[PDB]
Amino acid sequence: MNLYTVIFINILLSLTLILVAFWLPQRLPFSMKFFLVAITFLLFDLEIALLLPLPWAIQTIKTSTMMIMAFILVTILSLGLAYEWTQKGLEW
Amino acid sequence: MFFINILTLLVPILIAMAFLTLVERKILGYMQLRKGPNIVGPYGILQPFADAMKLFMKEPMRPLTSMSLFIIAPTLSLTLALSLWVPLPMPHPLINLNLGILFILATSSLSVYSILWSGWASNSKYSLFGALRAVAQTISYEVTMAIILLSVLLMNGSYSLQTLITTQEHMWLLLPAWPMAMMWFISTLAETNRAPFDLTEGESEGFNVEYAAGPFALFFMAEYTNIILMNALTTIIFLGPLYYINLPELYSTNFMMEALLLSSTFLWIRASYPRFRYDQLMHLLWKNFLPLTLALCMWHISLPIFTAGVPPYM
Amino acid sequence: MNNYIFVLSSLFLVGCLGLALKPSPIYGGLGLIVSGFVGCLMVLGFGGSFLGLMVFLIYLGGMLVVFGYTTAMATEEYPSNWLILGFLVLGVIMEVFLICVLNYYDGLGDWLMYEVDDVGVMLEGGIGVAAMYSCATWMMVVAGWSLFAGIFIIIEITR
Amino acid sequence: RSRAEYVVTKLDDLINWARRSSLWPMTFGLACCAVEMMHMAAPRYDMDRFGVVFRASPRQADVMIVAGTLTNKMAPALRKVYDQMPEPRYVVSMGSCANGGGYYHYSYSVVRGCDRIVPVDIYVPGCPPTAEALLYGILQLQRKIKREQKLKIWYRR
Amino acid sequence: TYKYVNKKEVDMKSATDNAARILMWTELIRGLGMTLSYLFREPATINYPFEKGPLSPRFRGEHALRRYPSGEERCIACKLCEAICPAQAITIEAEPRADGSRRTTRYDIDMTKCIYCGFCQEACPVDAIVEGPNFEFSTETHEELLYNKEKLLNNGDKWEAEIAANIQADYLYR
Amino acid sequence: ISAFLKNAWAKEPVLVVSFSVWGLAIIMPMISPYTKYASMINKATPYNYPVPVRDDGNMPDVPSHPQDPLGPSLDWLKNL
Amino acid sequence: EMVRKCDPHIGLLHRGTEKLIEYKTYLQALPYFDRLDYVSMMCNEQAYSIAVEKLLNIQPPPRAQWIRVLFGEITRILNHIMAVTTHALDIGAMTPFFWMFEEREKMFEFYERVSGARMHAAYIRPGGVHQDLPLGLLDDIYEFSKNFSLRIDEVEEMLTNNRIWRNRTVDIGVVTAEDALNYGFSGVMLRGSGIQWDLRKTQPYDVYDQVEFDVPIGSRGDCYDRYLCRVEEMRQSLRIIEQCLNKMPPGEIKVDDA
Amino acid sequence: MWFEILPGLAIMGVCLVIPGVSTAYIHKFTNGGKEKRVARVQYQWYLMERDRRISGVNRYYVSKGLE
Amino acid sequence: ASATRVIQKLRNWASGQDLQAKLQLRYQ
Amino acid sequence: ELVEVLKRGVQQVTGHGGLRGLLRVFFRANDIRIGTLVGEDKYGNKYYEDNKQFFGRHRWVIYTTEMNGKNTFWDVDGSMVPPEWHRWLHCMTDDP
Numbered sequence A: 001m002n003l004y005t006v007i008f009i010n011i012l013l014s015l016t017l018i019l020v021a022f023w024l025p026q027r028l029p030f031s032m033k034f035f036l037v038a039i040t041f042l043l044f045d046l047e048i049a050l051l052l053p054l055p056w057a058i059q060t061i062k063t064s065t066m067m068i069m070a071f072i073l074v075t076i077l078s079l080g081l082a083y084e085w086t087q088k089g090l091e092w
Numbered sequence B: 001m002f003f004i005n006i007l008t009l010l011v012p013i014l015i016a017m018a019f020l021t022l023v024e025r026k027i028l029g030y031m032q033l034r035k036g037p038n039i040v041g042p043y044g045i046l047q048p049f050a051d052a053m054k055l056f057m058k059e060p061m062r063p064l065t066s067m068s069l070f071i072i073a074p075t076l077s078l079t080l081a082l083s084l085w086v087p088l089p090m091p092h093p094l095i096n097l098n099l100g101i102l103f104i105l106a107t108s109s110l111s112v113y114s115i116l117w118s119g120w121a122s123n124s125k126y127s128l129f130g131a132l133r134a135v136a137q138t139i140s141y142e143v144t145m146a147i148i149l150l151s152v153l154l155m156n157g158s159y160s161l162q163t164l165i166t167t168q169e170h171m172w173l174l175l176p177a178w179p180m181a182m183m184w185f186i187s188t189l190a191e192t193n194r195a196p197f198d199l200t201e202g203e204s205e206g207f208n209v210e211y212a213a214g215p216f217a218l219f220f221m222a223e224y225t226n227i228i229l230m231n232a233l234t235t236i237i238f239l240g241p242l243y244y245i246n247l248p249e250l251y252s253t254n255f256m257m258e259a260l261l262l263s264s265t266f267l268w269i270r271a272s273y274p275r276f277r278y279d280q281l282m283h284l285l286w287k288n289f290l291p292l293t294l295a296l297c298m299w300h301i302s303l304p305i306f307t308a309g310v311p312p313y314m
Numbered sequence C: 001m002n003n004y005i006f007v008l009s010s011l012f013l014v015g016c017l018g019l020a021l022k023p024s025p026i027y028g029g030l031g032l033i034v035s036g037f038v039g040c041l042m043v044l045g046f047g048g049s050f051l052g053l054m055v056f057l058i059y060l061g062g063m064l065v066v067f068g069y070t071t072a073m074a075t076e077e078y079p080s081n082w083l084i085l086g087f088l089v090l091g092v093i094m095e096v097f098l099i100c101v102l103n104y105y106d107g108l109g110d111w112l113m114y115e116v117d118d119v120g121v122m123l124e125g126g127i128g129v130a131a132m133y134s135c136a137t138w139m140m141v142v143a144g145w146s147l148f149a150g151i152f153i154i155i156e157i158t159r
Numbered sequence D: 001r002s003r004a005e006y007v008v009t010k011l012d013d014l015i016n017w018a019r020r021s022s023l024w025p026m027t028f029g030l031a032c033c034a035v036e037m038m039h040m041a042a043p044r045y046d047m048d049r050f051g052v053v054f055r056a057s058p059r060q061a062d063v064m065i066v067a068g069t070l071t072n073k074m075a076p077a078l079r080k081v082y083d084q085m086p087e088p089r090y091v092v093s094m095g096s097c098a099n100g101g102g103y104y105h106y107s108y109s110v111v112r113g114c115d116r117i118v119p120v121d122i123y124v125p126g127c128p129p130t131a132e133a134l135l136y137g138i139l140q141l142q143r144k145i146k147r148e149q150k151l152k153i154w155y156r157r
Numbered sequence E: 001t002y003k004y005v006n007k008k009e010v011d012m013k014s015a016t017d018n019a020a021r022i023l024m025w026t027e028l029i030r031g032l033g034m035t036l037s038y039l040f041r042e043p044a045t046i047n048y049p050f051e052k053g054p055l056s057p058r059f060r061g062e063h064a065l066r067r068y069p070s071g072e073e074r075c076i077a078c079k080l081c082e083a084i085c086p087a088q089a090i091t092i093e094a095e096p097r098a099d100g101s102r103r104t105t106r107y108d109i110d111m112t113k114c115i116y117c118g119f120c121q122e123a124c125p126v127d128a129i130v131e132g133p134n135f136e137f138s139t140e141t142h143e144e145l146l147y148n149k150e151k152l153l154n155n156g157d158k159w160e161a162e163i164a165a166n167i168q169a170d171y172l173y174r
Numbered sequence F: 001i002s003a004f005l006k007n008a009w010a011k012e013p014v015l016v017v018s019f020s021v022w023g024l025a026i027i028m029p030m031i032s033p034y035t036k037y038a039s040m041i042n043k044a045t046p047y048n049y050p051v052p053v054r055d056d057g058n059m060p061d062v063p064s065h066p067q068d069p070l071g072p073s074l075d076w077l078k079n080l
Numbered sequence G: 001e002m003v004r005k006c007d008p009h010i011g012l013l014h015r016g017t018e019k020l021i022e023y024k025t026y027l028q029a030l031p032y033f034d035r036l037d038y039v040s041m042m043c044n045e046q047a048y049s050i051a052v053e054k055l056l057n058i059q060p061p062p063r064a065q066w067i068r069v070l071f072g073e074i075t076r077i078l079n080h081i082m083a084v085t086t087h088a089l090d091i092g093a094m095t096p097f098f099w100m101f102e103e104r105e106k107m108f109e110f111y112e113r114v115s116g117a118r119m120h121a122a123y124i125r126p127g128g129v130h131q132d133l134p135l136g137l138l139d140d141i142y143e144f145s146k147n148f149s150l151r152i153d154e155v156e157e158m159l160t161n162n163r164i165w166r167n168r169t170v171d172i173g174v175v176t177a178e179d180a181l182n183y184g185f186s187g188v189m190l191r192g193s194g195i196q197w198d199l200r201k202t203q204p205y206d207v208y209d210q211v212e213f214d215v216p217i218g219s220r221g222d223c224y225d226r227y228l229c230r231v232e233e234m235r236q237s238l239r240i241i242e243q244c245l246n247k248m249p250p251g252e253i254k255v256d257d258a
Numbered sequence H: 001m002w003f004e005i006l007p008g009l010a011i012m013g014v015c016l017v018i019p020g021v022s023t024a025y026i027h028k029f030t031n032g033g034k035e036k037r038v039a040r041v042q043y044q045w046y047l048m049e050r051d052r053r054i055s056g057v058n059r060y061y062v063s064k065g066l067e
Numbered sequence I: 001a002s003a004t005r006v007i008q009k010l011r012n013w014a015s016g017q018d019l020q021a022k023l024q025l026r027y028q
Numbered sequence J: 001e002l003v004e005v006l007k008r009g010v011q012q013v014t015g016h017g018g019l020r021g022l023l024r025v026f027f028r029a030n031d032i033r034i035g036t037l038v039g040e041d042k043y044g045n046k047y048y049e050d051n052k053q054f055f056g057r058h059r060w061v062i063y064t065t066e067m068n069g070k071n072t073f074w075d076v077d078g079s080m081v082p083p084e085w086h087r088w089l090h091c092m093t094d095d096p
C-alpha cells in the first residue's frame, strides 16, 4: 500500500507528461551472436538466481557445504564461459 | 503526511534532474573553453525549464508505427527511474523494503524493454538496429552489475540498503572491495548509456530517432534521473556517507556531496573519452570484467568464512 | 484491503488468455511481462518475498526480455490483433461469468495467510531457498549440471 | 489584469520565450559554410551560450541551417529532412550558395537557392557568411519568433 | 629527410608497469586530468552583441557605393566592375546624365549571387564600389538582399566615415 | 613457463588476476585460524527459543538461572 | 553489424566547377579553387597559381614565394586540425574539436588580416600574392606558432594514447603499400603505409626547397598510424612556418609584368 | 571562470538534501517524536502491535514503569 | 589568466605542463 | 588571494550603480564587469574598454533603451551600434 501510493503517483506523473505532450501542441537476423549473447545472458541470469540466496545461506550452520557448493557453481559456470571463449563464441 | 513525503523525494529530484542537464552543459563547456548557457535567465538557471517548454509544445509526430509500444516506452522509462528512488536510503528511506537491492536490480532490468519497445515501435531501420545492440549491452552489463552487488551483499549480510549504513560506520566499502567499485562505476556508466559506453543514439542519427517533443522528454528525463540514481547507489553501497543517529542530515549532506561529485565524474568522463565500439564494449564485459567479477565473487564468499567475519543477518 | 488476491488472479488469467490467443509475437511478450508482474505481486502478496522478486528478476527481465529479443531478430514479421483484443474483452466478462456462478453458490481474506507465526525472526522465504546448501544440496547440483549442459548443448544448435 | 486579451498575450510571450531561448539547430553541412558554422559552435563564438545546441537530429531540431550549395541531387533530400521535423520549424539559409545560387548560380546541377525547395525565414549573406554574421542571423530569428503572436490570433479568430 | 611516427624486454618491472596500466586505467586518468585543467582556464567566448570578434581594415563585408566629398557619386559607369565580377552579380546600364557627365541609371548588386570576392573593390578605377565593413545585413525576405543603386548609395552614406578610414589604412598596401 | 606468466601479466592482465583470486579463495578457507569459527559463531547465534528439558536428575544442564557456570559458553566469541 | 559492401555515391555536391571555369577568365576562376576544397582554402589556389604561372613561363617574386609557403603551411595546420578533431567528433571525442577550433579561429584571423576574408581569401593569385602582409602580421604568426605546439600536445594527452582511441583506430582500414599506389591514394594515405613520397620534397614547388622539414612516414599503416602522421605534419609545418618568419625576403609580392 | 557552474549545482544539491532531510523528519513527526520503528522480522511487528494494543491506538505512545 | 596561484597549480598539476607560458587568452 | 578574488566580485556588483542598476546589466548581458567609459554616442549607447581582459572581450558596448524609439532594452541588436563606433568595437582601429 504505502508503496502502491507512491507507484501510482509515479505512473500518474508520467502519463500526465505524455498526455500533455500530445494535447498541448494543438529485417535481417544476421547476428545469431545477438541471439547467442542473449542465450548466455539467461544461463548467467539463472545462475545469479541460484547465487541470490547466498546472503541467507551464509548463516547456515554447515558453512563447509555452503562454500563447497557455491564454489562449485561459480566454477562450473565460469568454465561454461571458458568454452564460450574457446570456440568462435563470445567473439561476435 | 506520507503524501507530502512523496512530493518531497519526487519534485525535489525532478528539479535537481533539470539542474543536472544545466551543470552538464556548463562543466562540459568550460572543459572545452566555452562559457556554456548563461544568457537565458541568470547564469543559465532558467535554461532547463526553457527547452522543456519548447519540447512539449513542438508536435509529437506519430510516424505514418505502433501507437502504444510508442507511448508505453517513455512512460515506462520515467516511471521505473523515478520509482527506483522510492527505496533509496538517504538518511532513512521512504518505503523501507527488506529485499531493497533486489528491488533496485529488478526495476533497472525492466528499463531495457522501453529501449526494445521504442525500437520496434519506430518501424525504421536505424531504430531497430540501435535497439538490438542497445538491449544487448544493457543486459550484458546487467550480468556483471548483479554479480558485483551479490559480492557486496555477502559482506553486508542482507539485501536491504538500510543495513549498509550500519556496515559502513567505521570505513567505506571502497577500501575493501575497491576492485569492484571501479567495476560498479564502469557498469553504472554502461547502464545509463552515458559516454564511454554510449553507442546507441550516438552521432549516428537509436531509440529517440523517431522520438520528438513529449516522448523525447520523458525518456530524456528518465536517463538523467537515472544518471543520478545510479551515482547515488554508488554513494550508499561503496562510498558510505558518515551517519550520526542524533543528526540524520549530515548523512544526507555528505550523500549530497558524494552524489554530486560522482555525478560530476560521468559528465567529466563523457567529454574526456571517445566512444567504444559495439563489440569493444561487450569484449570488455564478457572478457575483461566477467572473469574478474566471478572470481572476486568467490573471494567474497571466502573472505567472510575463513576471516570468521560472516556478516550478521538483520 | 480484501480479495486483493482474486483481482490479481483474474488479471493473471487475462494475461494468459492474451498469450493463448497467440497475439503477435512481441505484443504478447508484453502480455507475459504483464502477468509475470502480476504473479510477482501475488507471491509478494502471500508474504513471499524472495521468490516473488526472483521471477521479476529472472523470468521477467531475463527470460522474457531475451525472448522478445529474439523475436526482433526472427519472427518479427507481420501480416487481426485488434480483433484479438476485441475477443479478449469478450472472455474477460466471461471470466466474471464463471466467477458469478462460483459466487452464485460456494470470501477471501477469510484466509490468505494461514498461520502467521507472529513471534519469529527466521520465518521468511529465502531461508528455504537457501537449503540448496544445507539439507537440499542435490537440487543445487542438478540445476548446475543443466546450466553447464546448456552452454555445450546450445553451441551446436547454433552451429 | 484579467481581460483575456492581456492574459493571452502574456501566455504567448512565454511560449515565444521558450522556443526562442532554446533553438536546436541541425546542419546539413552542404559545402563549406559548414566550416563557418562549426566555428560558431566553437569557443570564440559559443552557440550553446545562446541556447542553440551544437548538434541535433531532424526529429528534435527546431531550425535547419542550410549551409552550402543545394545541388539538384541533394534537393530531394533537403526537402525530406525539412518535412521530417516538428510542427514549429524554421529554416536559416546560410551562404550566397544557398541564399541564391552563388558562384554556382548558372550551373546545371545547382538549385538557384534553397527557398525554391524549403521556405526560408532568415537569409544570412556572405560567401563564407562570417560566424558572427550567422550568429547575428540566429539572433534575428530569435527576434522573429519573439514577435510571433499565435494564441492572440487564435483568440481573435 | 623522413621520420618514423610509430616504428617499433619483458621484465616484471616492465610487465608489472604495463599490467597496472591496463588494470587501474592509468592513462585514462591522465586524460581526465587534462580536461579538469582547462575547466580552470578562462573561457575564450565573447558576449556577441556586447563584444565583437575583431575584423581588420581589408574585411570585405557588405557592398557600398561611395561619393566624392562634394557629393557627386564616384561611379562613372566604366562597367568593368561588372566585367570582373566572377558571379555575374553586378548589373549596370548607363546613359549620359543631363549634366553631360557619365553616370549609371541602374546599378544592381545581387548579394545572394555575390560571393564577396572583393575584386570589384580592386577593379574600380575611381574606387566607387568598396567592400564595406558591415557583415550584419541578414534579411527576412530574399528580395531585400537584391540591392539597387539607392540602397548601395545609402549604404555608402551610412558607412562612409569608416569606409574612408579603412581605405585610408590599406591604400599604401594596394 | 615464466613467459607464460610474464607476457600474460603484461598483456591479458585480467585473467591472471582473475584466476589468482579464484584460487586464493579456494585456499584461504582451507588454511586459516578462523575458518572454524564461522560455523560456530553462526551456530551460536540464538534465533529460536531454547526449550528446557525436564530434570529427571543427574544432569549437567544448567538448572535455574542460566547464569549457572554449567553449559555452553561464547567467551570464544567474546574476546574473539 | 558487418559491412559486406560499400558503394559510396557522389555528386551530392557536384556544382559544375570544371565547366563554369571554361566561361570565366583566369583571374575570375581563381575564387573557384578556394571553394574546391575550402578546409584547405589557399593551398588549392597555389596549385592554380603555379599552373597559370607555368603556362605563362612567369614565376612569382621571392617574397611572394615565401608568403605562399607561409600561408601554405598555416593552411596545412588548419586542415589537420579539421581532420583530426572532426575525426574524433564522429568517433565520439568532442573536446579536442573545441580545443583546436579556438586555435583555428586565431589562424583564420591571419587570413582575414592578410586577405580580407576569414576563409575563401583569393590572396594567392596567378602571379604572386595580391597584397603584401599587413605591417605586423609576421609577429603574430609567431606568437601563435610559439604556443600552438602545446595545443597539439594537449590533444595528444587526450587521444594519442587513449586506451580507447587506439582500439577504434588501430588495425582499421590497413592499406598495403602496393595497393595504395595502385588505387592512386597519393597522400598521407600512401605515406602512412610507409611509401616515402612528399611532392614537396620530391618535386619542390615555390620555395619549399629552401626550407628543411621531415616527412612523417608511417609503418603498420592503419587509422591510428596515419593519424599520428597528420599530428606529425602539424608539428613539421610549425618547423616550416618558423623558418619562413625567420627568413622572408624584402621585395615585391607580385610579378612586375603588368 | 569556472565560478559559474556552481549556481546550477547549488540548485541540484539543495534539491538532493531536501529529500533526505524531509523523509527523515516527516517520520519523526508522524511517529510521535521517535524514529519510525522498522518491522523487518515478525517479532519486531509483534512488539510493535503489542505496543499498539498496549495503549491508545498508536505505537509511538509508550506506557512506562508508571502503568 | 587571473589564476590566483592555486587554480594555476591545480591546472599545472592536472595538465602536467605549464599552460601559463602558452595561455589561451591572447594579450597585448 | 581568493579573498581579493571576492573583493573584486563585490566591487563589480557595486560598480553598476545600485542593486537595480546591476540587475539591469545582469539581465540584458548576463556578464558583470567594470571598465572605463570610452564614449557615449548620440544614439543611446555606452562603450567601455578594459586593457586587462583578453583580446576578444576587452572592448564591449552596453546598448541603451530606445536608440531610435524601438523599445531596444530587451531586443538588443548588433546593427544598433553606429558606423563611426563600429570599427572601434571590432578592433578595426585602436583610436576611439
Ligand SMILES: CCCCCCCCCCCCCCCCCC(=O)OC[C@H](COP(=O)(O)OCCN)OC(=O)CCCCCCCCCCCCCCCCC
Residues within 6 Å of the ligand: B174, B179, B180, B181, B182, B183, B185, B186, B189, B196, B234, B238, B269, B284, B288, B289, B292, B299, E022, E023, E024, E025, E028, E029, F012, F013, F014, F017, F021, G163
Ligand atoms: C588479497 C587481495 C584479493 C583481491 C586482489 C585484487 C587485485 C588487485 C585488483 C585487480 C583488479 C583491478 C582493476 C579492476 C577494474 C579494472 C578491470 C579491467 O581490466 O578493466 C577493463 C578495461 C581494460 O582495458 P583494455 O585495454 O580494453 O583491456 C586490456 C585487456 N584486454 O579497462 C577499461 O576499458 C576501462 C574503461 C573505463 C571508461 C571510463 C573510465 C572512467 C575513469 C574514471 C573513473 C574511475 C573509477 C572511479 C570509481 C569511483 C568510486 C566508485
Ligand SMILES: COC1=C(OC)C(=O)C(CC=C(C)C)=C(C)C1=O
Residues within 6 Å of the ligand: D026, D027, D028, D029, D030, D031, D034, D035, D037, D038, D041, D054, D055, D056, G086
Ligand atoms: C564539413 O562536413 C560536415 C561535417 O562533417 C565533417 C559535420 O559533421 C557537420 C555538422 C556540424 C555541426 C556544426 C553540427 C557539418 C556542418 C558538415 O558540413
Ligand code: SF4
Residues within 6 Å of the ligand: D030, D031, D032, D033, D067, D068, D069, D094, D095, D096, D097, D098, D102, D103, D126, D127, D128, D129, E115, G035, G038
Ligand atoms: S556560399 Fe561561399 S561558402 Fe557558402 S558554400 Fe557557396 S561558396 Fe562555399
Ligand code: SF4
Residues within 6 Å of the ligand: E074, E075, E076, E077, E078, E079, E080, E081, E082, E092, E123, E124, E125, E126, E127, E128, E129
Ligand atoms: S568600376 Fe567603380 S566606377 Fe566603374 S562602374 Fe564599377 S563601380 Fe562605377
